[PDB]
């Protein structure tokens, strides 16, 4: 396999399906990336993560630098070796978790004093041995005034160039990993356009839509995606960071997004929320205490093959670790089955029908 | 397979190795039973418990009756079905967790008001669908005066007869499960003898040594085992309840014990303690932060095949669920490997040498 090759196999409207080939493996798109905060996808062995269908996972630069430490992970052979996941890993840059500041970067106290900058973020991602490296950005909160959105976007573009140069100057990283740029601009079309133009001029292997799902509603997010995604190079992956709910994902794919990550299936799994084709349920609810059905009636995951709602209800009620394990495996598997249905439907030219059918049932 | 058949294949001094055959499977002895407190061996799927080598697990009557409830489990098809473990399950009777009281039984408040008695304990164990049912006893704390030890022992023997009759009166239970009696008498030889005689007169499928590992030291426990185990019928299994550490197990086998359970490998696994052939280690210790070796250098478990001390150190430090999962799997696997080495050495007539070698290295 090459360092990086994105190929689009089929299209339907703005939606695409295809593959990213990298040295450590192939990623089928549209893709969902489980989040492995501090070198673990919570409550799952890597083999279980793979068994659910994941092709790639996400690691958080900010958290890993705080514990166990980036240099330590490098000394131990890199993140893949450390955690036992040998397929691609994407690392975020830390901009989201950040949100003293200056044009040079940021200093902050560990929740010890730490520093992030375009150069240091790229370095940490190198030390981790990331396959997909993200530019270091400044993420403005919502709502943002046009002036402040413009300032953070402009700084992010200067930082995107610094990220590009840092990545390129490190031969081993440049030859073996990929670098994605991050579009900013809040909800403003003109700023989103300026940001897309700046990133395309610099040139990246992929383009993330940053700064969404930070407090604007789905309607607004979709409105911004409507104009923002077409601004990005068509022939590279489009990554919507930190999204999201199943319906968010479907609508974002309809608008040209190829990659997703979110803590929702894992975090809310531990909390008792299980995804089903008829919408989410909270397994802690008393109505499930004697329900012998699986979490979802169609799901092919090992959890739905083997255990009842009643059992998982008890485990979560009781605070048992196995409850977190089973909920998380099911939810991640559900997400991967959603992505597979999306990929197949686009391939077969029936994605619009799938989206309609999905919504009708999920929100019944 | 029969309802119950214990066969002794080989002996060395007081030590024995053999098999218990039951309808749901064969149990190799000496046996270690992982404890599954409230219908789960903490942090492990049942398939993982089996993969470590366990032939049987223990469930706690007291806890299960409180949550999710015995009647509820019965309605859902029994404990095996509920938790997904299809091999034998032994249930304790509740006497240990108990320790208003009367000759009829005990009432207590949930940590709702609940009741236990010989009849109710046997009933709960039936509702759970237990394969090995334990008589309901009264467990005196250590130290005990001779008078109080005698009173609790005598009550326990009356309760053993009530347990026997309750079990026998329930045809489905009598035909498909086994019933073990529990010897009491604290540290007193005469009381232990009276208790053994009473239990043998009633007749049970197996005999537990109760009331030890409740505050007396290993020396005292071993002294009591020295005279107590030979009092029990030789041709039935001997079960030392709530023991214990690897060295406890080895010494108890040397004294004629066939079955063990304890929370130690699971509970202390979650706390950071890993068993090794060179003694226990606490993985949280800073000395392990960059140690690339497996938990134990010889252990054949999947954890030792795949992850380093450094990684598990980080997980436990961070409070990650995967840390509990990996520690627990390793510790249970270690215990099963200990039992296998014990069984093989007795079979081969070299158990005394094994015990000496084990101690020399474990305590080096
Ligand atoms: N939802 C927005 C988001 C999530 N993670 C992120 N990481 C970075 N660097 N930038 C961003 O805008 C975001
Ligand atoms: N270590 C003693 C012990 C553990 N569990 C027990 N359960 C019962 N019923 N009786 C006992 O004596 C014990
Ligand atoms: Zn499922
Ligand atoms: Zn091991």
Author numbering:
A (entry chain A), B (entry chain A): 11 to 109, 116 to 127, 131 to 383
From the paper:
Bacterial Tgt functions as a homodimer in which the protomer consists of a (βα)8 barrel harbouring a Zn2+ binding subdomain close to the C-terminus. The reaction follows a ping-pong mechanism including a covalent Tgt⋅tRNA intermediate. Hence, in an attempt to generate a model system for the active site of human Tgt and to gain insights into the relevance of particular amino acids for substrate base selectivity, we adapted the Z. mobilis Tgt active site by site-directed mutagenesis in order to mimic that of the human enzyme.
Next, we analysed and compared the structures of the studied Tgt variants in complex with preQ1. Superimposition of the structural models reveals that preQ1 is identically positioned in all investigated variants including “wild type” Tgt (mean rmsd = 0.20 Å±0.07 Å). In “wild type” Tgt this cavity harbors two well-ordered water molecules which are displaced in the Tgt(Cys158Val)·preQ1 complex structure by the isopropyl side chain of Val158. A conspicuous structural change upon binding of preQ1 is observed within the binding pockets of those Tgt variants which harbour the Cys158Val mutation. Both in Tgt(Cys158Val) and Tgt(Cys158Val/Val233Gly) the binding of preQ1 provokes a shift of Val158 towards the ligand enabling five Van-der-Waals interactions of its isopropyl side chain with the 7-deazaguanine scaffold of preQ1 (3.5 Å to 4.3 Å calculated by CONTACSYM). In addition, a noticeable change of the proximate Thr159 whose side chain is rotated by about 90° is observed. So far, in no other crystal structure of Z. mobilis Tgt or any variant thereof such a conformational change of Thr159 has been observed upon ligand binding. A notable consequence of the Cys158Val exchange is the significantly decreased affinity of the enzyme towards preQ1 but not guanine.
